Every structure is written in structure tokens, then in C-alpha cells.
Amino acid sequence: TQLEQAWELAKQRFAAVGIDVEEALRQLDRLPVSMHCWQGDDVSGFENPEGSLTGGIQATGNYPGKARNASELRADLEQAMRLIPGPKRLNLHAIYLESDTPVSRDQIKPEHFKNWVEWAKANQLGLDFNPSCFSHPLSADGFTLSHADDSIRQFWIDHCKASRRVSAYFGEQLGTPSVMNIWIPDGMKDITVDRLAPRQRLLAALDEVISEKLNPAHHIDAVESKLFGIGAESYTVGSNEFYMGYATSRQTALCLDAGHFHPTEVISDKISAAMLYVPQLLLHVSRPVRWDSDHVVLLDDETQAIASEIVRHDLFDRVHIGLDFFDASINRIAAWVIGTRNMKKALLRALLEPTAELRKLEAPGDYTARLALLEEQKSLPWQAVWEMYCQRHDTPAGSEWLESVRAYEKEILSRR
Amino acid sequence: TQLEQAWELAKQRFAAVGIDVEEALRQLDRLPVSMHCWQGDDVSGFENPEGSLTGGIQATGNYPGKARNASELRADLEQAMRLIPGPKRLNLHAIYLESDTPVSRDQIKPEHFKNWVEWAKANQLGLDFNPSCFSHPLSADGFTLSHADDSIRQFWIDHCKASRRVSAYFGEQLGTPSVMNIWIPDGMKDITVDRLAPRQRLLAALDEVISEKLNPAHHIDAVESKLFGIGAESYTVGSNEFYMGYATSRQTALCLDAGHFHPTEVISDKISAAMLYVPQLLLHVSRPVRWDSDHVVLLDDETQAIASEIVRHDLFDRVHIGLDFFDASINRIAAWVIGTRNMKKALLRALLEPTAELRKLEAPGDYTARLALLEEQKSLPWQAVWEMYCQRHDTPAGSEWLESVRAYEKEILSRR
Amino acid sequence: TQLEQAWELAKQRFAAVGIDVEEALRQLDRLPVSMHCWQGDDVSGFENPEGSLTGGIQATGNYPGKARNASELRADLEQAMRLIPGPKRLNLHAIYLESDTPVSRDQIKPEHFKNWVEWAKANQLGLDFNPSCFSHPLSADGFTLSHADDSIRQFWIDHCKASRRVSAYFGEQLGTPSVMNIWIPDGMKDITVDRLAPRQRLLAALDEVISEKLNPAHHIDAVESKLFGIGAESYTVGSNEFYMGYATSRQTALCLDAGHFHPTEVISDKISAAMLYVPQLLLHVSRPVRWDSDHVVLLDDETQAIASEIVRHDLFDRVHIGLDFFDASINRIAAWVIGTRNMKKALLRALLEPTAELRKLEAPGDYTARLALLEEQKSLPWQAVWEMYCQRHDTPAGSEWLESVRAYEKEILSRR
Amino acid sequence: TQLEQAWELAKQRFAAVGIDVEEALRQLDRLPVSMHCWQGDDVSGFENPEGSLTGGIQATGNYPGKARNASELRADLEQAMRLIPGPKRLNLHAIYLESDTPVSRDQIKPEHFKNWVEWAKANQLGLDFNPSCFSHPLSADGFTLSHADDSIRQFWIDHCKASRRVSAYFGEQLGTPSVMNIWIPDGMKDITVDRLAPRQRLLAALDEVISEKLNPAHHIDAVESKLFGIGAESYTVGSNEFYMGYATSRQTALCLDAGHFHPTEVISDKISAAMLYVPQLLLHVSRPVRWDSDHVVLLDDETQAIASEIVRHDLFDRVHIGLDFFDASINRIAAWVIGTRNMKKALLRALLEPTAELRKLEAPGDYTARLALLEEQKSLPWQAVWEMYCQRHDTPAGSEWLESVRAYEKEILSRR
Numbered sequence A, B, C, D: 001t002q003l004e005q006a007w008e009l010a011k012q013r014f015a016a017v018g019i020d021v022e023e024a025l026r027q028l029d030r031l032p033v034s035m036h037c038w039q040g041d042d043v044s045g046f047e048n049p050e051g052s053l054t055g056g057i058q059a060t061g062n063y064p065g066k067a068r069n070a071s072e073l074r075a076d077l078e079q080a081m082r083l084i085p086g087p088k089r090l091n092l093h094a095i096y097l098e099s100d101t102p103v104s105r106d107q108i109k110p111e112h113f114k115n116w117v118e119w120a121k122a123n124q125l126g127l128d129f130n131p132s133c134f135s136h137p138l139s140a141d142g143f144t145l146s147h148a149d150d151s152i153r154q155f156w157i158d159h160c161k162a163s164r165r166v167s168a169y170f171g172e173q174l175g176t177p178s179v180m181n182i183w184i185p186d187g188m189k190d191i192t193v194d195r196l197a198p199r200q201r202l203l204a205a206l207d208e209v210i211s212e213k214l215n216p217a218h219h220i221d222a223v224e225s226k227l228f229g230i231g232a233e234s235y236t237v238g239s240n241e242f243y244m245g246y247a248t249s250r251q252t253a254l255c256l257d258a259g260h261f262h263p264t265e266v267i268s269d270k271i272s273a274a275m276l277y278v279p280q281l282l283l284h285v286s287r288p289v290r291w292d293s294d295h296v297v298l299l300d301d302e303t304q305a306i307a308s309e310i311v312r313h314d315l316f317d318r319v320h321i322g323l324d325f326f327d328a329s330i331n332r333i334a335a336w337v338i339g340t341r342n343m344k345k346a347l348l349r350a351l352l353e354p355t356a357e358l359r360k361l362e363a364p365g366d367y368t369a370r371l372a373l374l375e376e377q378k379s380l381p382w383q384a385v386w387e388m389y390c391q392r393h394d395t396p397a398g399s400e401w402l403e404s405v406r407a408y409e410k411e412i413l414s415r416r
């Protein structure tokens, strides 16, 4: 009722500036967010859960209740899912495989992910994938796909090749292509002599990894740059330019992670440049706090900036929105909830923007009006629209979702 | 009525989280925003209006309609003010003096600002002040208060001392202390051999500058650090530590400017630290875009963080909120309008935060709850309260204010 | 003799670590540095010299004696050149053409550069070139090649196409391909609604611009990204990713400018990545001080890192090294001299590095030894080798060159 | 002989510029470097060596041969020391205490460091100290001195109070005041509501901590700011402005750590500013690679700028020079060796600078000459001077020191 009313006023407000709230809602329904599985168990995986997170990535917090297997994970995920409106996907790491016996990374098969697949069907989720190139003895030296050792190198190439197959299976089975992201930790902590060679090896390996042609309808390859990681601060083989080059040249999708750049550097600006040259873009929304810290996505300037770009450019088909963060210092379900909802809220507000009007003002050099209007947009009643969206999707419109979280914690997590 | 309706709903939603919108509105009225006069004529001043803006500060845009004198300036200020709700002050620079004949800077008098004073009275505005230590032949070497030349030095000293008197005069007349900010461009463009001497001169100069005791009820001294300027990139005499030591040791107020720090550096963090050692703070809100660009303040992450800090700590008395930006690329009046409204919006929002609750959660280590709630606060109907605030002050609640600016521009600005 | 002695000692020291100083000297002779002409007259050019430097690029200092025509510029250049050992090139801007009557930018011709060419021949200098897309009426809106106006856009397109021909002309005549760099200021000061369209337009334009096939032996196209400029802080059409994609996909050269990235971002790291995708690199060495301030190049960490990368990779052929800075606050000749020699000193040091050994240690995981060695390199007697370099090229080995500059200043610059 | 010869040449060259190399050598011996003990055992300490390094501080590498006790530590220190020329000191942490039985941190005594002292006596070293406020159950919440719980708070206060007594004990016994630095990890990983209260508590605590007047001839109190740490990214109680204010207000010494600031921020600039307010400076030399990474100090731009400042200002008495870094990815002895020598190399180069002349050029506005000379200074034969310094101190002049380290590694480290 209050919502209802609030909704009506909003409807009218927006109408007056040429904005159709309904349509906005429809459109928001066309923008799924792929939730990252790893937020649930601290990137532990099911290969060897308790066995140090590596790659220059880190888990800070030790809050209790982490999931410890597929089952807990799925349960945790559903809980989160019920408190997040609209479309979602699940982004999986190869270490999240389910097998009675241990599987060599270079040997995974679709079969190791059937449960995930059946579950996804049941939950009306699309699935995404990622070879796991870290937290492994063969990753110990800080090199994987660029490793100078042929054999090591081969093992990683093989794992990647296999991963493409699982991914393709996901798309076959789900009817929506699985975006399979390649991220590797390869780099050097200190002053490096030869930055080239590794880059050369990485180039060759990737080409081999994507050599097998797969159905685009079921599978997409993406490469993700990174500036630096803890323990590999001075050099990253797979740098921004390297992958920009790579994706452009081999026509794979390019993954842009909001926490993987320089200080003050923003992927929102990159979206429009990159799409002129690469087929698709996988966007990893994450909050870096003075480093690639992986904090939870907030409804902030850059998250909003990113949404705007996607929406202004009508990137519904070519962009894949994913979360990329891991905060172990708080409730993990809450983490996914806050994150996802935030992304959606940024999206919605972008959908509520009178872009054409603004675009038109800009074209005319009416900078005064553009700024002004861009700013006014912030005090328009979008919240009302967001809450109607929640309501429609049977999701708590406000802070009440916290009680559910609290409740599940008490009831479940508390026992883990 | 829609407003009224929206207001009522909000009133209720907030109340449900323990927030009283009516009190909020009242509190907002206790937070004036000191608008910088220099935004109206591109820091031209009236001494010698057309005569290059110096000091490492720039004016970009050349948009038409700039004020050309006190009269235009006041008119322009008036338009702006009618479009901005609640309390405001006028922050004046010494070069805005009004004299039939030329006045040496080191000789200005209270009488050179009587009109400004009268006007202020009439408009119920408090006045703040600043000595002008740039765009002057004796500032051309890039040194003023720290100039090795005793005589040049003296001159600036004197100008400063005289400015304290003008400021005190304002306080006396207006019944509200004038905060007199001291900013100098002093620094070097390139690799510097001696960073010490200039700082030594600066320190001594300052002490001299403030040696005359004035009524604290009418006048406050503030000092403003700065990281770098165009043309003085390598070193700034009046650095952050410099003024922090100064203000702490001499007990003056400290001026913190949102555009005068390192990349990713934020004054919002600094507020709670500095208030433990300095009597008062002068806050310069500004948006630096890649440098001390002086862009209009937006309702953004930092402007909000700033507001929150002031409000959380109940800094009503010890904080002086001011704007410090200059964008000549768009309508000047709009520039002021957007920025002032934005500051006020941020403050309002801070006033609507359930801090005590939050504070309590944080103290108990409930970081899940704190984050979640901080975030949910962004989808609370604050805009309705803001709009009511506008209404109550007879100010447009939405974008309509542009029309006004537009019309003033046609009728007025168009003829300049 | 002292030099001789020091040299001999050095010769032996280096020999002992497997380094041949003689060979390094020879190598150094294979690495010209392209001097930027614009440092001589404050990017004034000869179209309309006194007529505001625009493009978000600035000239700070106002030191006296700037060159006022091609004659003075050449004289100044020669003086500089006699103080810089080894190979050099001259990098010209379109606005430095020499014509009795005005020439529309869109109609320049080889013939407008004949004297530069004859001079170059006589001075044994290769020539480089650049279209001048700024400081012009049709660049006044901040857009050139991405301008939405078809005709303006065409104009800049034409001007670039015409510049290619001048460029080829240089390569024909001099027998060394002229690298023709493309840099445009296009961007926005403030928050932008559409970053895509301008990139789209830029993309198409460049394509048209390079459509004419010219002889590689005489001509090379290069594109240069930029992060931001004064008066275009928020967005730059031709971003890093933009050109990275561009160069990669159209196989043009990619220009990496040391002052054009984010804080802490270094192109030295980008060299080995870009060369895997682009056929050539044009490197602009510059010292950005908190902004693309264009300070003189120092023998500093980053200039050395760039040097090392080129040398380590044996990029003698694919890399074009040039200067890109402008300091008008000191003697301009000295500016050139300092920067040029510094780049050469950085090169020589790189050439005196026992790379193989190091490379070898790194590949074995001997990071201890690597770090140790790299650092000890710094206290080896490279100064001696540099000084002998100077001597063999009949150039002052030390600070004495300043006398020369001072002398020219007195005799010539003093009367400008 | 070759050294002697190079030495003589250098001698002459520097004299020609008014620099006396013998005097330099002498002044260099007046500038000890305080080696941090913790690099040798990865901050393990002796309370509970194997028991996770906390505080937002990390140890990356796991290279073998870390010291396991005081004995190992001392032996390792000695090996390092024989490879580092001229004066050094040892900086101790409270966790390196030697006791048969466990000692609550709140009750340590001078007697728990007796061996250290006797060893220092025998090795002619001065000693520095630090309370350890991390890697402890009572520091698990991320708060220590700012902890809201009175008792926890009380424990850390007492620990600091007792550490002061140990420190004074060092001063007494050694005849040189021990500088006792106070660093705590206290901060928040995420968005914080109340930054004020912890600061107020910290303030009050520090005042209590230093309430006991000790003999300045034996002891000095220093406070160390920090910007952020892993797991405490968002807020740090003891910020730059907090400690600048504190040190200025209580007249303690101020610790500036080169890895503890914002990107591009440098302490070299801060020295001259701070010195005007605080009695003494504690300077931590460290290399932050994209974060407070704690990499080994290189002879780099900033290390050199710090040295230059100390020396230019004749800060021999008021500044205490120490190392603050921890790299566990390479041989720990070498880490110390590299960093220490690098710091000494930078100081020596500063000592060889013709400051007065340069100062004099600068004061006259001869910026051309200043830059030119500053830069020419880099090609002067400082290496020979350094190498003589090494020889006079019975230390390897070059890279040969690695063989000693390698040898120790084989004989001793290999068996740990």
C-alpha cells in the first residue's frame, strides 16, 4: 500500500520527464547478474577446501558459517537468491566440481558438474565457468599458463581446454551460453628482467587453449587482465594491454574487473572503447579498497558508472554482468545479497535515466543542462521503483531481508 | 500535493527507523553553506578583472555571461540564492573590494567592503573572507608569504594583516564571525633543492600575520594546505603536514580542501583526526577531476562521506562548510546552484541516518548489519524530505530551477 | 686523460662481469632519439605563432628567448644538437610548415616542408611528423577527428591524410621512414552521457585517414592515447584501450607516452605486452608531475625502466624513441639537452646490463641474486663509459655544456 | 689498486666541484642505519614464533633458512653486518624478548633483553625498540590502544609503558638513546560509522602511555602513522593527521614510513615540513609496491630524495634512520644487505652533492642551471667513493658479497 502509493507518485514523476517506470522494470528483467560461487566458501572449492587460498588473492575476515560442500553452498546460494530480485546466474570455478574421487585438473569433465547443472535447471539459472589456475602445487611458482616448464605449462593448457568443454556442456544443457573466463595469477613479486618471454608463452598457450572450436551458442571464451596481486606486485604477465591485444586479435570476449586497475582507473570508461573491438565483454564488478581487496559492491559512483554505460549503450547482448568479490569478514549470504542488489539498483537507475534527452543536450553543447539534469536525476524517486521491482519478485524491498539472513544464520550457519 | 503525499510516506518510513524528518529539516537549517564568490566572474575580481588568473589555479570553459562588477555579481548571487534552500553565506576574496580608485593590497580597509556588508545584511547572509595572494605582480615569482625578498614578503604580510581587519569588521557587523582563510600559491614547478627555507619563512610570516589579537566572536583564522598547482607541481611550501603543524601549534582553524590532496586521498577521513587538535575546521568541498580541477560538487561518494562526518560528530559549531570550485564551461549560476544544493542534499542525508543505531552495531562488531544498513539507507525516500525542505524555503524542489536560470540568462546574461 | 683513465678502469670493470663497453658504445649509436621541435617555440608553430596553445596541453614558465621562426628554431636546434652525443631525429608538427602564404591544414604539401627536409639532409637527421589537430578554430569545440559535424570532421580527416603524404615525402627523401603520430585532444571536461559515438566516429575517421597505402619504407602511422587533459578531465575519446584495439586491429604503430597514463602507471611495463600485437612502437618519454605536465626527462627510475625494456628486448628496429615534453620555465635549449642526454644515459646503462646473466638467474628462480645484481649494477662505473661516448662524439662530457648554452643565450637569445 | 686509482680520479673530479670525498666519507660514518630485526625470522618473534603474522602486515615468499631463535637471529644479523659498511643499529620488537618462561606483554622488563644489550655492546651497536601490538589474542579484534574495552585497552597501554622502560634501559646501557616507536594496526576493513571515538581513545591512551618521564638522553618516543593495511583497508585510527597533530602537540618524535602513504605520496617532502614542529624524526625507509608491500629498499628516486633531504638539512641529530620492510621471498640476509647498503649509498650521494652552490642557484632563480646540475650530478663518479667506503670498512665493494651470503646459506641456512 505505502509502496503502492509511493509507486504511483513515482510513476507519475518519471512519466513527467519521459520516463516509463514499467518499461524500466521490464528491461531490468533482461539484465541478469552472475553471482560468483566462491564468495560462499572462501574460494575453498571442493577439491581440497582447507588448503590455503593462493594466487595473490586473499580472504580477510574469518567470519563463521562458510559453506563446506556443494550442498551447503547450494543452500546458501538459494537463500541469497530469495532475497535478490530478478534474474541471476551462477558463476562457477572448476574447483567446485563434485566427484567422489579426486580429479586431476587437467582431466575434469562435464560429468563432474552435473549436479550444478541439474540444480541450475531447477532454479532457472544460467551458468558461467572458470578454469582454476591457482591454489595448486603446480601453480606454486607463481606461473601457470606462462610457466617456462613445458610440462607445467601443458597441464594448465589442458585444464583450460577441459574447462571449455564443461562450459560448452553448460550452455548445451541450459540453453544459454556459459561465459568461461580465463584468469591466471602469473607474475613476479619483484623487479623483473624478462617481462617478454612469459608473455610470449602465455600468448601461445592461450591460442592453444582456444584452438578447439565450440558452439558460440553454448560457449564464450573471456580473458581477464590484472594489475598486480599480493606476492606478485611488480609484474603481471596478463596485463591490460596484453589482453586487450589478445581479445582484439583472437576475438574472444574481454573481461574487465573493476578492482584490477590503477589508482583512479575505471572500467566504466573502458566499456565503450573496448566494445569497438571485441565481440563481448564480461564485466566483474568488485570494490577495491586501496588494493584488489575484493570488497562488496556498493551502490556507489563507479558501480553506477558502470551500469550507465551498459545501459546507455544498449549492451544487453554483448555484456555479461558478474560479481567478483569475496569478503569473509561478514555474513557471506549478506555479502552476496548486498552486492547483487546493489548492482541491480545501479542498473535500474541507469534504466531510469532520460538518456536520449541527455544525449541530445550533450550533442548541442548544453553542458549546463546536462550536468544539471544528470544531478537532478539523483533526487528523483527511483527507490519507489526499485521497491516495486522487489515486491513484484517477492523480495524484501528493504532492510527486512536482513532478518531472513539473521534467521538462517541462527538456524543453520550457527551449526557449521 | 504529490510532494505532500510523498512527504507523508517518507515521514512514516523514516519514523519507522527512528528518524524524525521534521527534526532533520530543522537541523539542516543549522548548516549554512558559504558560497564562494569567485565562481561568478572567474576569479577575476574587481581590482583588475581582465588580467590573467594565476597561482596554479585555472578557469576552463569560456562560457558567456560572467559578472563584470559587484553589481552583476550580487545580482547573479541573488538569482542563485533564490534557487538554493536554507542558510548560506558569502565567501569573499580581497580582490572583490569596491573602491573608486585603486588600492594597494597591503592597504585595504573595511570601508572597501561596505557594500558587500550592507548587502549581506539585507540578505541575511554571513560573510567570510580571504586575502588574495595571487594574480599579482608581487606573486609572479611564485612566492608571496614565503618570498625570500623581505620586502615582497612584507607586502604579503601586510595584505594578510589588513585582511584580518576586514574580516573582523564583517564579524562585527554581521554578528557572525568571519572565517578568514589563508591560501598562497607558493611552491616550485620542478626539482627543488631547498624545501626548508621557504617553509621557515612561511611559518614566521604566519605568526606575524596573526599576531594582532582580534575578537574570536568576529573573526577566525584558517590555513589551507595544497598538494600542487599547475606550474608549481613539484613542491608546495604550505603543504598538508606544514599547516597541520601550524594549526595545531598556533591554534588556528585548519582548512581542508577536497581537491588539494593525493590521488584517492579524502578529507572526509581527516575531519575526526584534525578536530582532536585544532579548534576549528574550514571545509572546502570541491571535485578534483585528475588534478585540482575545481569542478562542481556532485552528490557523490566523497561529498556524502564529508557530510556524514560533520553530522555524525555533531560538528555544527566547529565546522565551517564552504565551496571551492570554479567551472567556467557552463552557466555560472547553475554551477553554484548545483553544487550548493548537492552539499545540502548530502548533509540532509546525513541528518537522516540512524547513526546511534549504526554506531551501536559497529561497536558490537555487527559489521554485517552495519554494512547492510548503511547500504539500505540509500534506498530510503530521502528525496521526499529534501523536496519538502525546498518547498518550505520556497525553492523549486526539482529540475524546474533550470528554467529560471535559463530565463535569467536570456534576459540578462545574454546582454553581457 | 682523466676521462681516458677512468674509461680504462671502467673498461676493465665491466669486462670482468662480461660487459663490453666498446660494444655498448656501438650499440648506443644505433638508437636515435627523435627530438620534438615544439620545445623551441612553445608549440607556437609558424601558422599563427602567438595564438593560444590549446588542446588541454599547456605551456608554463614564460622564460625568455623562444624561437620565433624556422630560422631561429633551426639555430636553436643546432646548438642543442652540438651538445647531445650520437644519433638524433627531428620530430615535426604540421604547424611548423614554411610557406609565404597561409595554407589550410587540410591542404598542406610536401613542399611546405622542403627546407626542413634540406636541413635534415644537411644535418644527417631523420625526420618524424605529426598532424596538428589543435590550436585552431575547428578544434575549438574540443573535437576534431571525432567531431560530430561532418564537415569539421572531414577537415581533420583531410589534414591527416595530407600529413601522411608529407611524412612519406620525408621518408623518401631522407631514406629513413618518418613515423607519423596521431594525437587529438578530443574529449570532455565533465560528466559525459555518450562516450561511445565519438569513439565510433574516431574509429571510422582513422580508417579513412589511413586508407591510402604508402610505402612502409618511408612512412609509418602511429596512434597515441591519453588519459586526460586540462579542460577535458573527464573523458578522452582516444583512450588507451581505444588505440590499443585500433593499433592492434589495423596494424598501425602504437605510441606510448610516459606522461599519459594514471598515477603510478608506467609504459615501461606496456612495451613487452604491446609488441606482441602491434608491429611498431613509438615511445614518447616525458615526465608527468601530478598531471601530464610535460616536464623534462630525468635520469630516473621510469626513464631507465623504459630504456631497459627496449634494450632487453632488442627492439632496435620496432621502437622509435622520442621526446614529448615542454618546459617553458627554463632555457629551452637546455631543456632539450638535459632530456636528450638523459634518455641516452638511460640507454647506455641498459646497454651495460649483463642481461643474459640476469635473465639466466631469473629463469632459475634466483631472485636473491637477481635483485642483488640489478642493484649492484648501479654502482658500476657507467659514468665513465658515458663520458667517453660524449668525447667520441665531440660533446661535453659534463656540466660544461651549460656554458655553451649560457653563451648562446647571451649572444642570441638575449636579443629575441 | 684499480679502486685506489678510481678513487683518486673521483677525488679530483669531486674536488673540482668543491666536494671533498674524504670529508664525505667521514660524514657518512655519522649516519647509522637501524636494521630491523624482524626481517630475519619473518616477524615471528620469540614469544610464539610460529603463530600467524597479524596487523594488516604480511610476509610473502616462504624462502627457507629463516632464523628460529635469538641465537640464529644474531648470527644472521652478524653475517649481514659484515657485509654492510659503517655504522648500524638494531631495531627491536618487544616479541624478540628472551625469557625461559612466558611473559605477559604487559609485564616485560629490561631484564628480558639483557642478551640483546650485551650483544649490542659487543658489536658496537645502538638499539631501538618497539612495543608489539599485533599478532596477539588481545589484538584480534583489530584494536589495541584504541580498543573500546577498557581492560584490553589497559593491557596495551601497560605494554607500551613497560616497553618505554626497556627502551630507556637500552639508552642507559648503550650510551645512545633508543628510539621507541609506536605503531598499532587499529583500523577497519570496511565502511565505518565512527572514526572519532577510537581516535579519542587513542589520544588518551598515548598520553597515558607517555606520562612517565624518562631521560631523553636514553629514550625517545616516536608515533607512526599508516594509511591502510590488509583487512583494515578503510580506516586507520592512527592516521597521518592524527600523529602529526599528536607529535606536534605532545612533542614526541614523528615516524614517517615511506610505504605508509597514498599513491605518489612521498615522505621526502614531509621531512622539512615536520621538522618545523616536532622535535625529532624517525624515518622508515621501505618500498611499497602497489600497497604497503614492504619490499627491500632500492637505490631509487625516493630513497635518494629522502637521503638528500636529511643531508641538505643537516639533520644528523634530529633524524633517526631505519629500515621498515620484510621480504621473505629471498635470502633474508641479502634482503638486509641490499636495503642497508642502498640506504647508505643514497646518503653518500647526498653527501657528495654541491648543495650550497645548488642552493645558491635556486635562490637566484637559475632553474636552468639547477636542473642541469642536479642531473649532471648523476654522472659524477660517486661509485668510486662508495667503493672506497666499503673497502675502508672491510666490506666488499661489489657483488662479491653475494658469495658470502651464498656460502653462509650452504653451511648454515641449509640446515634450518
Ligand SMILES: C[C@H](O)[C@H](O)[C@@H](O)[C@@H](O)C=O
Pocket (backbone or CB within 6 Å): A038, A043, A057, A130, A183, A224, A226, A257, A292, A324
Ligand atoms: C577467484 C577469482 O577468479 C579471481 O579474483 C580473479 O577473477 C581475479 O579477479 C583475481 O584477482
Ligand SMILES: C[C@H](O)[C@H](O)[C@@H](O)[C@@H](O)C=O
Pocket (backbone or CB within 6 Å): B038, B043, B056, B057, B130, B183, B224, B226, B229, B257, B292, B324
Ligand atoms: C581561489 C581559491 O582561494 C583557490 O582555489 C584556493 O582556495 C585553492 O584551492 C587554490 O588552488
Ligand SMILES: C[C@H](O)[C@H](O)[C@@H](O)[C@@H](O)C=O
Pocket (backbone or CB within 6 Å): C038, C043, C057, C130, C183, C224, C226, C257, C292, C324
Ligand atoms: C603537442 C604534442 O603533440 C602533444 O603533447 C601530444 O603529442 C600529447 O602528448 C598531448 O599532450
Ligand SMILES: C[C@H](O)[C@H](O)[C@@H](O)[C@@H](O)C=O
Pocket (backbone or CB within 6 Å): D038, D043, D057, D130, D183, D224, D226, D257, D292, D324, D325
Ligand atoms: C612490524 C612493523 O613494526 C610494521 O611494519 C610497522 O612499523 C608499520 O610499518 C606497519 O606496516
Ligand SMILES: [Mn+2]
Pocket (backbone or CB within 6 Å): A257, A259, A260, A286, A292, A294, A324
Ligand atoms: Mn579481484
Ligand SMILES: [Mn+2]
Pocket (backbone or CB within 6 Å): B257, B259, B260, B286, B292, B294, B324
Ligand atoms: Mn582548489
Ligand SMILES: [Mn+2]
Pocket (backbone or CB within 6 Å): C257, C259, C260, C286, C292, C294, C324
Ligand atoms: Mn603529454
Ligand SMILES: [Mn+2]
Pocket (backbone or CB within 6 Å): D257, D259, D260, D286, D292, D293, D294, D324
Ligand atoms: Mn610497511
Ligand SMILES: [Zn+2]
Pocket (backbone or CB within 6 Å): A224, A257, A284, A324
Ligand atoms: Zn575478476
Ligand SMILES: [Zn+2]
Pocket (backbone or CB within 6 Å): B224, B256, B257, B284, B324
Ligand atoms: Zn580551497
Ligand SMILES: [Zn+2]
Pocket (backbone or CB within 6 Å): C224, C257, C284, C324
Ligand atoms: Zn606524446
Ligand SMILES: [Zn+2]
Pocket (backbone or CB within 6 Å): D224, D256, D257, D284, D324
Ligand atoms: Zn614503519
